[PDB]
């Protein structure tokens, strides 16, 4: 049950909805989205590599904020 | 040379920029993105399915409008 944190440059509610859709499509994840602070937290067994690649499918700029 | 027309639910400048990035990655395309009218036109040799799948993976709501 590793807990990862990512930076995603979402600018409106529509941006947040799209992040939700790609994560729902992958499955096996428990996530939380903080729009104002451009942050996404994900608890999952999927590798960090897979989570990073999935988020990048949105076309948004993504970086890693680490574990915890 | 074929010109495909799509409807894409973009709600801010960031949404439009994200669409342009996934298309740039695919390559072999010439496009025009209209934010206020929520439309994207694409001139390319890639198949209709390849283009649709590329737009769908962004997590945004997409639908095909026509071809010429
Ligand atoms: O944000 C896109 C889109 O949302 C609308 C309602 O569909 O406006 C809402 O969201 C804005 C955030 O960017 C708020 O500032 C606004 O007050 C709220 O109604 C559209 O107006 C906008 O195009
Ligand atoms: O991008 U224009 O017409
Ligand atoms: Hg947006």
mmCIF file of N, CA and C and ligand atoms in Angstrom:
data_model
loop_
_atom_site.group_PDB
_atom_site.id
_atom_site.type_symbol
_atom_site.label_atom_id
_atom_site.label_comp_id
_atom_site.label_asym_id
_atom_site.label_seq_id
_atom_site.Cartn_x
_atom_site.Cartn_y
_atom_site.Cartn_z
ATOM 1 N N UNK A 1 0.830 -1.238 0.000
ATOM 2 C CA UNK A 1 0.000 0.000 0.000
ATOM 3 C C UNK A 1 0.852 1.270 0.000
ATOM 4 N N UNK A 2 1.830 1.361 -0.918
ATOM 5 C CA UNK A 2 2.687 2.553 -0.981
ATOM 6 C C UNK A 2 1.863 3.806 -1.305
ATOM 7 N N UNK A 3 2.252 4.946 -0.737
ATOM 8 C CA UNK A 3 1.542 6.205 -0.972
ATOM 9 C C UNK A 3 2.438 7.202 -1.710
ATOM 10 N N UNK A 4 2.087 7.496 -2.961
ATOM 11 C CA UNK A 4 2.852 8.414 -3.813
ATOM 12 C C UNK A 4 2.194 9.787 -3.938
ATOM 13 N N UNK A 5 3.002 10.809 -4.218
ATOM 14 C CA UNK A 5 2.491 12.163 -4.410
ATOM 15 C C UNK A 5 3.072 12.724 -5.709
ATOM 16 N N UNK A 6 2.213 13.289 -6.557
ATOM 17 C CA UNK A 6 2.640 13.868 -7.835
ATOM 18 C C UNK A 6 2.201 15.319 -8.016
ATOM 19 N N UNK A 7 2.943 16.047 -8.845
ATOM 20 C CA UNK A 7 2.620 17.429 -9.177
ATOM 21 C C UNK A 7 2.010 17.376 -10.586
ATOM 22 N N UNK A 8 0.827 17.967 -10.765
ATOM 23 C CA UNK A 8 0.148 17.991 -12.070
ATOM 24 C C UNK A 8 -0.407 19.411 -12.255
ATOM 25 N N UNK A 9 -0.006 20.098 -13.326
ATOM 26 C CA UNK A 9 -0.455 21.478 -13.529
ATOM 27 C C UNK A 9 -1.873 21.672 -14.074
ATOM 28 N N UNK A 10 -2.856 21.312 -13.253
ATOM 29 C CA UNK A 10 -4.269 21.455 -13.593
ATOM 30 C C UNK A 10 -4.652 22.923 -13.381
ATOM 31 N N UNK A 11 -5.441 23.491 -14.291
ATOM 32 C CA UNK A 11 -5.841 24.892 -14.152
ATOM 33 C C UNK A 11 -7.340 25.159 -13.966
ATOM 34 N N UNK A 12 -8.185 24.164 -14.230
ATOM 35 C CA UNK A 12 -9.633 24.320 -14.036
ATOM 36 C C UNK A 12 -10.268 22.995 -13.624
ATOM 37 N N UNK A 13 -11.556 23.033 -13.290
ATOM 38 C CA UNK A 13 -12.260 21.830 -12.878
ATOM 39 C C UNK A 13 -12.248 20.748 -13.941
ATOM 40 N N UNK A 14 -12.285 21.165 -15.204
ATOM 41 C CA UNK A 14 -12.249 20.222 -16.308
ATOM 42 C C UNK A 14 -10.938 19.450 -16.322
ATOM 43 N N UNK A 15 -9.856 20.114 -15.915
ATOM 44 C CA UNK A 15 -8.548 19.470 -15.857
ATOM 45 C C UNK A 15 -8.583 18.345 -14.824
ATOM 46 N N UNK A 16 -9.203 18.621 -13.677
ATOM 47 C CA UNK A 16 -9.315 17.641 -12.594
ATOM 48 C C UNK A 16 -10.168 16.440 -13.000
ATOM 49 N N UNK A 17 -11.260 16.693 -13.718
ATOM 50 C CA UNK A 17 -12.134 15.612 -14.172
ATOM 51 C C UNK A 17 -11.384 14.655 -15.105
ATOM 52 N N UNK A 18 -10.557 15.201 -15.993
ATOM 53 C CA UNK A 18 -9.785 14.378 -16.931
ATOM 54 C C UNK A 18 -8.753 13.507 -16.206
ATOM 55 N N UNK A 19 -8.155 14.040 -15.141
ATOM 56 C CA UNK A 19 -7.182 13.271 -14.358
ATOM 57 C C UNK A 19 -7.920 12.097 -13.711
ATOM 58 N N UNK A 20 -9.126 12.364 -13.219
ATOM 59 C CA UNK A 20 -9.950 11.331 -12.592
ATOM 60 C C UNK A 20 -10.284 10.207 -13.582
ATOM 61 N N UNK A 21 -10.651 10.574 -14.808
ATOM 62 C CA UNK A 21 -11.003 9.573 -15.815
ATOM 63 C C UNK A 21 -9.861 8.625 -16.186
ATOM 64 N N UNK A 22 -8.649 9.149 -16.371
ATOM 65 C CA UNK A 22 -7.524 8.287 -16.738
ATOM 66 C C UNK A 22 -7.130 7.363 -15.588
ATOM 67 N N UNK A 23 -7.298 7.827 -14.351
ATOM 68 C CA UNK A 23 -6.964 6.996 -13.202
ATOM 69 C C UNK A 23 -8.029 5.911 -13.011
ATOM 70 N N UNK A 24 -9.294 6.255 -13.249
ATOM 71 C CA UNK A 24 -10.384 5.284 -13.129
ATOM 72 C C UNK A 24 -10.183 4.177 -14.166
ATOM 73 N N UNK A 25 -9.674 4.555 -15.335
ATOM 74 C CA UNK A 25 -9.434 3.611 -16.430
ATOM 75 C C UNK A 25 -8.323 2.609 -16.108
ATOM 76 N N UNK A 26 -7.293 3.066 -15.399
ATOM 77 C CA UNK A 26 -6.183 2.195 -15.021
ATOM 78 C C UNK A 26 -6.655 1.184 -13.977
ATOM 79 N N UNK A 27 -7.344 1.678 -12.954
ATOM 80 C CA UNK A 27 -7.847 0.807 -11.905
ATOM 81 C C UNK A 27 -6.812 0.468 -10.850
ATOM 82 N N UNK A 28 -7.265 -0.169 -9.773
ATOM 83 C CA UNK A 28 -6.367 -0.550 -8.696
ATOM 84 C C UNK A 28 -5.691 0.629 -8.028
ATOM 85 N N UNK A 29 -6.419 1.734 -7.891
ATOM 86 C CA UNK A 29 -5.878 2.935 -7.265
ATOM 87 C C UNK A 29 -6.880 3.620 -6.334
ATOM 88 N N UNK A 30 -6.349 4.327 -5.344
ATOM 89 C CA UNK A 30 -7.141 5.103 -4.389
ATOM 90 C C UNK A 30 -6.484 6.481 -4.459
ATOM 91 N N UNK A 31 -7.168 7.461 -5.049
ATOM 92 C CA UNK A 31 -6.580 8.792 -5.211
ATOM 93 C C UNK A 31 -7.343 9.986 -4.630
ATOM 94 N N UNK A 32 -6.617 11.092 -4.481
ATOM 95 C CA UNK A 32 -7.147 12.349 -3.953
ATOM 96 C C UNK A 32 -6.555 13.499 -4.776
ATOM 97 N N UNK A 33 -7.414 14.381 -5.282
ATOM 98 C CA UNK A 33 -6.983 15.503 -6.126
ATOM 99 C C UNK A 33 -7.175 16.881 -5.475
ATOM 100 N N UNK A 34 -6.092 17.657 -5.390
ATOM 101 C CA UNK A 34 -6.127 19.005 -4.808
ATOM 102 C C UNK A 34 -5.863 20.020 -5.928
ATOM 103 N N UNK A 35 -6.939 20.500 -6.546
ATOM 104 C CA UNK A 35 -6.854 21.443 -7.661
ATOM 105 C C UNK A 35 -6.069 22.741 -7.412
ATOM 106 N N UNK A 36 -6.428 23.506 -6.368
ATOM 107 C CA UNK A 36 -5.719 24.758 -6.085
ATOM 108 C C UNK A 36 -4.205 24.621 -5.941
ATOM 109 N N UNK A 37 -3.762 23.522 -5.337
ATOM 110 C CA UNK A 37 -2.338 23.301 -5.123
ATOM 111 C C UNK A 37 -1.648 22.409 -6.156
ATOM 112 N N UNK A 38 -2.370 22.054 -7.218
ATOM 113 C CA UNK A 38 -1.828 21.231 -8.302
ATOM 114 C C UNK A 38 -1.140 19.955 -7.826
ATOM 115 N N UNK A 39 -1.826 19.204 -6.969
ATOM 116 C CA UNK A 39 -1.265 17.978 -6.421
ATOM 117 C C UNK A 39 -2.226 16.795 -6.503
ATOM 118 N N UNK A 40 -1.664 15.607 -6.711
ATOM 119 C CA UNK A 40 -2.446 14.374 -6.797
ATOM 120 C C UNK A 40 -1.768 13.288 -5.961
ATOM 121 N N UNK A 41 -2.507 12.718 -5.009
ATOM 122 C CA UNK A 41 -1.977 11.656 -4.147
ATOM 123 C C UNK A 41 -2.589 10.315 -4.556
ATOM 124 N N UNK A 42 -1.742 9.297 -4.710
ATOM 125 C CA UNK A 42 -2.197 7.971 -5.128
ATOM 126 C C UNK A 42 -1.644 6.822 -4.278
ATOM 127 N N UNK A 43 -2.547 5.992 -3.758
ATOM 128 C CA UNK A 43 -2.170 4.823 -2.954
ATOM 129 C C UNK A 43 -2.425 3.629 -3.866
ATOM 130 N N UNK A 44 -1.367 2.904 -4.227
ATOM 131 C CA UNK A 44 -1.517 1.781 -5.147
ATOM 132 C C UNK A 44 -0.323 0.825 -5.169
ATOM 133 N N UNK A 45 -0.546 -0.373 -5.700
ATOM 134 C CA UNK A 45 0.516 -1.364 -5.818
ATOM 135 C C UNK A 45 1.185 -1.241 -7.185
ATOM 136 N N UNK A 46 0.558 -0.500 -8.099
ATOM 137 C CA UNK A 46 1.139 -0.293 -9.425
ATOM 138 C C UNK A 46 2.454 0.457 -9.229
ATOM 139 N N UNK A 47 3.445 0.168 -10.068
ATOM 140 C CA UNK A 47 4.751 0.823 -9.961
ATOM 141 C C UNK A 47 4.674 2.329 -10.190
ATOM 142 N N UNK A 48 5.663 3.053 -9.668
ATOM 143 C CA UNK A 48 5.723 4.502 -9.842
ATOM 144 C C UNK A 48 5.808 4.805 -11.335
ATOM 145 N N UNK A 49 6.506 3.936 -12.068
ATOM 146 C CA UNK A 49 6.685 4.076 -13.515
ATOM 147 C C UNK A 49 5.335 4.083 -14.224
ATOM 148 N N UNK A 50 4.467 3.154 -13.832
ATOM 149 C CA UNK A 50 3.140 3.044 -14.432
ATOM 150 C C UNK A 50 2.254 4.236 -14.068
ATOM 151 N N UNK A 51 2.311 4.672 -12.813
ATOM 152 C CA UNK A 51 1.507 5.813 -12.383
ATOM 153 C C UNK A 51 1.938 7.093 -13.109
ATOM 154 N N UNK A 52 3.247 7.277 -13.285
ATOM 155 C CA UNK A 52 3.767 8.463 -13.977
ATOM 156 C C UNK A 52 3.316 8.478 -15.440
ATOM 157 N N UNK A 53 3.455 7.339 -16.111
ATOM 158 C CA UNK A 53 3.061 7.228 -17.514
ATOM 159 C C UNK A 53 1.564 7.487 -17.709
ATOM 160 N N UNK A 54 0.741 6.958 -16.809
ATOM 161 C CA UNK A 54 -0.708 7.140 -16.898
ATOM 162 C C UNK A 54 -1.083 8.620 -16.775
ATOM 163 N N UNK A 55 -0.485 9.311 -15.812
ATOM 164 C CA UNK A 55 -0.773 10.729 -15.623
ATOM 165 C C UNK A 55 -0.342 11.563 -16.831
ATOM 166 N N UNK A 56 0.778 11.200 -17.449
ATOM 167 C CA UNK A 56 1.274 11.932 -18.613
ATOM 168 C C UNK A 56 0.348 11.827 -19.835
ATOM 169 N N UNK A 57 -0.562 10.854 -19.831
ATOM 170 C CA UNK A 57 -1.495 10.675 -20.949
ATOM 171 C C UNK A 57 -2.468 11.846 -21.087
ATOM 172 N N UNK A 58 -2.621 12.614 -20.014
ATOM 173 C CA UNK A 58 -3.517 13.765 -20.009
ATOM 174 C C UNK A 58 -2.984 14.907 -20.874
ATOM 175 N N UNK A 59 -1.673 14.912 -21.105
ATOM 176 C CA UNK A 59 -1.055 15.976 -21.877
ATOM 177 C C UNK A 59 -0.567 17.094 -20.961
ATOM 178 N N UNK A 60 -0.762 16.908 -19.657
ATOM 179 C CA UNK A 60 -0.346 17.892 -18.656
ATOM 180 C C UNK A 60 1.110 17.648 -18.235
ATOM 181 N N UNK A 61 1.738 18.666 -17.646
ATOM 182 C CA UNK A 61 3.120 18.549 -17.172
ATOM 183 C C UNK A 61 3.081 17.856 -15.811
ATOM 184 N N UNK A 62 3.841 16.774 -15.671
ATOM 185 C CA UNK A 62 3.856 15.986 -14.435
ATOM 186 C C UNK A 62 5.256 15.737 -13.852
ATOM 187 N N UNK A 63 5.358 15.793 -12.524
ATOM 188 C CA UNK A 63 6.613 15.534 -11.815
ATOM 189 C C UNK A 63 6.303 14.746 -10.535
ATOM 190 N N UNK A 64 7.339 14.194 -9.901
ATOM 191 C CA UNK A 64 7.181 13.370 -8.695
ATOM 192 C C UNK A 64 7.560 14.091 -7.399
ATOM 193 N N UNK A 65 6.651 14.082 -6.421
ATOM 194 C CA UNK A 65 6.895 14.736 -5.134
ATOM 195 C C UNK A 65 7.343 13.749 -4.052
ATOM 196 N N UNK A 66 7.445 12.474 -4.421
ATOM 197 C CA UNK A 66 7.909 11.455 -3.491
ATOM 198 C C UNK A 66 6.900 10.609 -2.734
ATOM 199 N N UNK A 67 7.427 9.753 -1.860
ATOM 200 C CA UNK A 67 6.612 8.878 -1.024
ATOM 201 C C UNK A 67 6.192 9.667 0.212
ATOM 202 N N UNK A 68 5.101 9.244 0.845
ATOM 203 C CA UNK A 68 4.583 9.916 2.035
ATOM 204 C C UNK A 68 4.021 11.286 1.684
ATOM 205 N N UNK B 1 -3.731 14.204 -46.089
ATOM 206 C CA UNK B 1 -4.582 15.257 -46.710
ATOM 207 C C UNK B 1 -6.020 15.246 -46.189
ATOM 208 N N UNK B 2 -6.547 14.066 -45.818
ATOM 209 C CA UNK B 2 -7.922 14.024 -45.306
ATOM 210 C C UNK B 2 -8.074 14.943 -44.092
ATOM 211 N N UNK B 3 -9.200 15.646 -44.004
ATOM 212 C CA UNK B 3 -9.448 16.554 -42.885
ATOM 213 C C UNK B 3 -10.543 16.019 -41.963
ATOM 214 N N UNK B 4 -10.157 15.626 -40.750
ATOM 215 C CA UNK B 4 -11.100 15.092 -39.772
ATOM 216 C C UNK B 4 -11.560 16.187 -38.815
ATOM 217 N N UNK B 5 -12.825 16.122 -38.401
ATOM 218 C CA UNK B 5 -13.396 17.108 -37.488
ATOM 219 C C UNK B 5 -13.915 16.441 -36.205
ATOM 220 N N UNK B 6 -13.462 16.943 -35.054
ATOM 221 C CA UNK B 6 -13.853 16.396 -33.753
ATOM 222 C C UNK B 6 -14.418 17.432 -32.786
ATOM 223 N N UNK B 7 -15.170 16.933 -31.810
ATOM 224 C CA UNK B 7 -15.726 17.748 -30.737
ATOM 225 C C UNK B 7 -14.922 17.308 -29.503
ATOM 226 N N UNK B 8 -14.327 18.254 -28.774
ATOM 227 C CA UNK B 8 -13.540 17.927 -27.572
ATOM 228 C C UNK B 8 -13.925 18.928 -26.479
ATOM 229 N N UNK B 9 -14.361 18.419 -25.327
ATOM 230 C CA UNK B 9 -14.803 19.274 -24.221
ATOM 231 C C UNK B 9 -13.676 19.980 -23.463
ATOM 232 N N UNK B 10 -13.180 21.075 -24.035
ATOM 233 C CA UNK B 10 -12.100 21.865 -23.437
ATOM 234 C C UNK B 10 -12.715 23.065 -22.713
ATOM 235 N N UNK B 11 -12.291 23.321 -21.476
ATOM 236 C CA UNK B 11 -12.859 24.430 -20.714
ATOM 237 C C UNK B 11 -11.912 25.541 -20.230
ATOM 238 N N UNK B 12 -10.658 25.514 -20.676
ATOM 239 C CA UNK B 12 -9.681 26.551 -20.326
ATOM 240 C C UNK B 12 -8.506 26.461 -21.298
ATOM 241 N N UNK B 13 -7.626 27.460 -21.269
ATOM 242 C CA UNK B 13 -6.467 27.451 -22.147
ATOM 243 C C UNK B 13 -5.596 26.229 -21.913
ATOM 244 N N UNK B 14 -5.523 25.792 -20.658
ATOM 245 C CA UNK B 14 -4.732 24.622 -20.320
ATOM 246 C C UNK B 14 -5.252 23.363 -20.994
ATOM 247 N N UNK B 15 -6.567 23.281 -21.184
ATOM 248 C CA UNK B 15 -7.175 22.126 -21.844
ATOM 249 C C UNK B 15 -6.736 22.068 -23.307
ATOM 250 N N UNK B 16 -6.685 23.229 -23.953
ATOM 251 C CA UNK B 16 -6.280 23.314 -25.356
ATOM 252 C C UNK B 16 -4.805 22.965 -25.520
ATOM 253 N N UNK B 17 -3.975 23.437 -24.597
ATOM 254 C CA UNK B 17 -2.547 23.148 -24.670
ATOM 255 C C UNK B 17 -2.282 21.649 -24.522
ATOM 256 N N UNK B 18 -3.050 20.985 -23.660
ATOM 257 C CA UNK B 18 -2.887 19.548 -23.432
ATOM 258 C C UNK B 18 -3.204 18.759 -24.696
ATOM 259 N N UNK B 19 -4.244 19.178 -25.411
ATOM 260 C CA UNK B 19 -4.618 18.512 -26.653
ATOM 261 C C UNK B 19 -3.474 18.637 -27.666
ATOM 262 N N UNK B 20 -2.883 19.827 -27.761
ATOM 263 C CA UNK B 20 -1.790 20.051 -28.707
ATOM 264 C C UNK B 20 -0.568 19.187 -28.408
ATOM 265 N N UNK B 21 -0.319 18.914 -27.131
ATOM 266 C CA UNK B 21 0.833 18.099 -26.752
ATOM 267 C C UNK B 21 0.705 16.629 -27.146
ATOM 268 N N UNK B 22 -0.462 16.030 -26.920
ATOM 269 C CA UNK B 22 -0.627 14.629 -27.277
ATOM 270 C C UNK B 22 -0.585 14.446 -28.793
ATOM 271 N N UNK B 23 -1.031 15.454 -29.541
ATOM 272 C CA UNK B 23 -1.002 15.373 -31.002
ATOM 273 C C UNK B 23 0.433 15.550 -31.505
ATOM 274 N N UNK B 24 1.193 16.426 -30.852
ATOM 275 C CA UNK B 24 2.587 16.662 -31.231
ATOM 276 C C UNK B 24 3.383 15.366 -31.064
ATOM 277 N N UNK B 25 3.067 14.618 -30.008
ATOM 278 C CA UNK B 25 3.751 13.359 -29.717
ATOM 279 C C UNK B 25 3.466 12.301 -30.774
ATOM 280 N N UNK B 26 2.213 12.217 -31.210
ATOM 281 C CA UNK B 26 1.834 11.254 -32.237
ATOM 282 C C UNK B 26 2.611 11.574 -33.507
ATOM 283 N N UNK B 27 2.632 12.852 -33.872
ATOM 284 C CA UNK B 27 3.350 13.273 -35.063
ATOM 285 C C UNK B 27 2.573 13.087 -36.354
ATOM 286 N N UNK B 28 3.073 13.694 -37.427
ATOM 287 C CA UNK B 28 2.423 13.585 -38.721
ATOM 288 C C UNK B 28 1.048 14.229 -38.778
ATOM 289 N N UNK B 29 0.882 15.356 -38.093
ATOM 290 C CA UNK B 29 -0.404 16.043 -38.080
ATOM 291 C C UNK B 29 -0.307 17.561 -38.190
ATOM 292 N N UNK B 30 -1.381 18.153 -38.706
ATOM 293 C CA UNK B 30 -1.534 19.599 -38.851
ATOM 294 C C UNK B 30 -2.915 19.835 -38.245
ATOM 295 N N UNK B 31 -3.001 20.674 -37.216
ATOM 296 C CA UNK B 31 -4.284 20.898 -36.551
ATOM 297 C C UNK B 31 -4.643 22.350 -36.258
ATOM 298 N N UNK B 32 -5.906 22.552 -35.889
ATOM 299 C CA UNK B 32 -6.442 23.861 -35.530
ATOM 300 C C UNK B 32 -7.367 23.615 -34.334
ATOM 301 N N UNK B 33 -7.069 24.253 -33.204
ATOM 302 C CA UNK B 33 -7.865 24.088 -31.986
ATOM 303 C C UNK B 33 -8.672 25.353 -31.659
ATOM 304 N N UNK B 34 -9.990 25.195 -31.548
ATOM 305 C CA UNK B 34 -10.924 26.295 -31.262
ATOM 306 C C UNK B 34 -11.504 26.101 -29.858
ATOM 307 N N UNK B 35 -11.059 26.906 -28.894
ATOM 308 C CA UNK B 35 -11.537 26.754 -27.519
ATOM 309 C C UNK B 35 -13.003 27.124 -27.282
ATOM 310 N N UNK B 36 -13.404 28.355 -27.635
ATOM 311 C CA UNK B 36 -14.803 28.739 -27.413
ATOM 312 C C UNK B 36 -15.856 27.805 -28.016
ATOM 313 N N UNK B 37 -15.565 27.212 -29.169
ATOM 314 C CA UNK B 37 -16.521 26.311 -29.799
ATOM 315 C C UNK B 37 -16.266 24.828 -29.512
ATOM 316 N N UNK B 38 -15.228 24.544 -28.724
ATOM 317 C CA UNK B 38 -14.885 23.176 -28.336
ATOM 318 C C UNK B 38 -14.718 22.227 -29.522
ATOM 319 N N UNK B 39 -13.897 22.628 -30.488
ATOM 320 C CA UNK B 39 -13.662 21.814 -31.677
ATOM 321 C C UNK B 39 -12.188 21.707 -32.065
ATOM 322 N N UNK B 40 -11.839 20.591 -32.699
ATOM 323 C CA UNK B 40 -10.472 20.326 -33.143
ATOM 324 C C UNK B 40 -10.513 19.718 -34.548
ATOM 325 N N UNK B 41 -9.809 20.332 -35.496
ATOM 326 C CA UNK B 41 -9.755 19.826 -36.871
ATOM 327 C C UNK B 41 -8.346 19.295 -37.128
ATOM 328 N N UNK B 42 -8.245 18.134 -37.772
ATOM 329 C CA UNK B 42 -6.940 17.526 -38.036
ATOM 330 C C UNK B 42 -6.728 17.004 -39.463
ATOM 331 N N UNK B 43 -5.643 17.449 -40.094
ATOM 332 C CA UNK B 43 -5.272 16.995 -41.438
ATOM 333 C C UNK B 43 -4.151 15.990 -41.211
ATOM 334 N N UNK B 44 -4.369 14.742 -41.609
ATOM 335 C CA UNK B 44 -3.362 13.714 -41.388
ATOM 336 C C UNK B 44 -3.623 12.441 -42.182
ATOM 337 N N UNK B 45 -2.586 11.614 -42.298
ATOM 338 C CA UNK B 45 -2.686 10.345 -43.005
ATOM 339 C C UNK B 45 -3.027 9.227 -42.024
ATOM 340 N N UNK B 46 -2.866 9.498 -40.729
ATOM 341 C CA UNK B 46 -3.178 8.508 -39.703
ATOM 342 C C UNK B 46 -4.653 8.151 -39.799
ATOM 343 N N UNK B 47 -4.988 6.928 -39.404
ATOM 344 C CA UNK B 47 -6.363 6.455 -39.458
ATOM 345 C C UNK B 47 -7.289 7.203 -38.505
ATOM 346 N N UNK B 48 -8.586 7.102 -38.775
ATOM 347 C CA UNK B 48 -9.613 7.737 -37.959
ATOM 348 C C UNK B 48 -9.530 7.171 -36.540
ATOM 349 N N UNK B 49 -9.310 5.862 -36.444
ATOM 350 C CA UNK B 49 -9.207 5.195 -35.150
ATOM 351 C C UNK B 49 -7.980 5.628 -34.357
ATOM 352 N N UNK B 50 -6.858 5.817 -35.046
ATOM 353 C CA UNK B 50 -5.630 6.241 -34.380
ATOM 354 C C UNK B 50 -5.803 7.641 -33.794
ATOM 355 N N UNK B 51 -6.408 8.536 -34.569
ATOM 356 C CA UNK B 51 -6.635 9.904 -34.117
ATOM 357 C C UNK B 51 -7.625 9.943 -32.951
ATOM 358 N N UNK B 52 -8.730 9.205 -33.068
ATOM 359 C CA UNK B 52 -9.743 9.168 -32.010
ATOM 360 C C UNK B 52 -9.163 8.625 -30.700
ATOM 361 N N UNK B 53 -8.402 7.539 -30.793
ATOM 362 C CA UNK B 53 -7.797 6.932 -29.612
ATOM 363 C C UNK B 53 -6.811 7.887 -28.945
ATOM 364 N N UNK B 54 -6.087 8.653 -29.756
ATOM 365 C CA UNK B 54 -5.113 9.605 -29.236
ATOM 366 C C UNK B 54 -5.801 10.701 -28.419
ATOM 367 N N UNK B 55 -6.951 11.170 -28.895
ATOM 368 C CA UNK B 55 -7.701 12.208 -28.189
ATOM 369 C C UNK B 55 -8.400 11.648 -26.948
ATOM 370 N N UNK B 56 -8.916 10.427 -27.058
ATOM 371 C CA UNK B 56 -9.621 9.765 -25.957
ATOM 372 C C UNK B 56 -8.757 9.512 -24.721
ATOM 373 N N UNK B 57 -7.493 9.164 -24.934
ATOM 374 C CA UNK B 57 -6.604 8.867 -23.816
ATOM 375 C C UNK B 57 -6.331 10.044 -22.886
ATOM 376 N N UNK B 58 -6.651 11.260 -23.329
ATOM 377 C CA UNK B 58 -6.432 12.455 -22.512
ATOM 378 C C UNK B 58 -7.414 12.530 -21.343
ATOM 379 N N UNK B 59 -8.473 11.732 -21.411
ATOM 380 C CA UNK B 59 -9.472 11.729 -20.360
ATOM 381 C C UNK B 59 -10.588 12.734 -20.587
ATOM 382 N N UNK B 60 -10.562 13.418 -21.731
ATOM 383 C CA UNK B 60 -11.595 14.403 -22.046
ATOM 384 C C UNK B 60 -12.706 13.746 -22.863
ATOM 385 N N UNK B 61 -13.876 14.381 -22.902
ATOM 386 C CA UNK B 61 -15.020 13.855 -23.651
ATOM 387 C C UNK B 61 -14.852 14.204 -25.128
ATOM 388 N N UNK B 62 -14.786 13.176 -25.977
ATOM 389 C CA UNK B 62 -14.578 13.347 -27.420
ATOM 390 C C UNK B 62 -15.606 12.629 -28.298
ATOM 391 N N UNK B 63 -15.931 13.227 -29.447
ATOM 392 C CA UNK B 63 -16.862 12.623 -30.406
ATOM 393 C C UNK B 63 -16.490 13.045 -31.834
ATOM 394 N N UNK B 64 -16.738 12.161 -32.799
ATOM 395 C CA UNK B 64 -16.413 12.421 -34.207
ATOM 396 C C UNK B 64 -17.548 13.177 -34.903
ATOM 397 N N UNK B 65 -17.206 14.226 -35.649
ATOM 398 C CA UNK B 65 -18.210 15.039 -36.343
ATOM 399 C C UNK B 65 -18.289 14.835 -37.858
ATOM 400 N N UNK B 66 -17.146 14.666 -38.511
ATOM 401 C CA UNK B 66 -17.174 14.483 -39.950
ATOM 402 C C UNK B 66 -15.820 14.372 -40.617
ATOM 403 N N UNK B 67 -15.848 14.132 -41.925
ATOM 404 C CA UNK B 67 -14.634 13.969 -42.707
ATOM 405 C C UNK B 67 -14.737 14.609 -44.088
ATOM 406 N N UNK B 68 -13.628 15.198 -44.522
ATOM 407 C CA UNK B 68 -13.527 15.838 -45.823
ATOM 408 C C UNK B 68 -12.041 15.979 -46.149
HETATM 409 O O1 LIG C 1 -13.872 26.717 -16.004
HETATM 410 C C1 LIG C 1 -14.476 26.402 -17.230
HETATM 411 C C2 LIG C 1 -15.880 26.930 -17.344
HETATM 412 O O2 LIG C 1 -16.588 26.779 -16.103
HETATM 413 C C3 LIG C 1 -17.596 27.760 -15.987
HETATM 414 C C4 LIG C 1 -18.953 27.070 -15.777
HETATM 415 O O3 LIG C 1 -19.152 26.093 -16.803
HETATM 416 O O4 LIG C 1 -17.275 28.677 -14.870
HETATM 417 C C5 LIG C 1 -17.116 28.156 -13.522
HETATM 418 O O5 LIG C 1 -15.705 27.818 -13.225
HETATM 419 C C6 LIG C 1 -14.771 28.969 -13.233
HETATM 420 C C7 LIG C 1 -13.384 28.488 -12.929
HETATM 421 O O6 LIG C 1 -12.513 28.756 -14.034
HETATM 422 C C8 LIG C 1 -15.245 29.994 -12.188
HETATM 423 O O7 LIG C 1 -14.359 31.153 -12.191
HETATM 424 C C9 LIG C 1 -16.635 30.442 -12.510
HETATM 425 O O8 LIG C 1 -17.087 31.383 -11.547
HETATM 426 C C10 LIG C 1 -17.576 29.216 -12.489
HETATM 427 O O9 LIG C 1 -18.934 29.568 -12.785
HETATM 428 C C11 LIG C 1 -17.497 28.593 -17.310
HETATM 429 O O10 LIG C 1 -17.838 29.958 -17.130
HETATM 430 C C12 LIG C 1 -16.049 28.409 -17.701
HETATM 431 O O11 LIG C 1 -15.889 28.664 -19.105
HETATM 432 O O1 LIG C 2 -5.580 28.167 -33.984
HETATM 433 U U1 LIG C 2 -6.646 28.893 -35.127
HETATM 434 O O2 LIG C 2 -7.707 29.613 -36.265
HETATM 435 HG HG1 LIG C 3 -8.824 23.177 -18.155
#
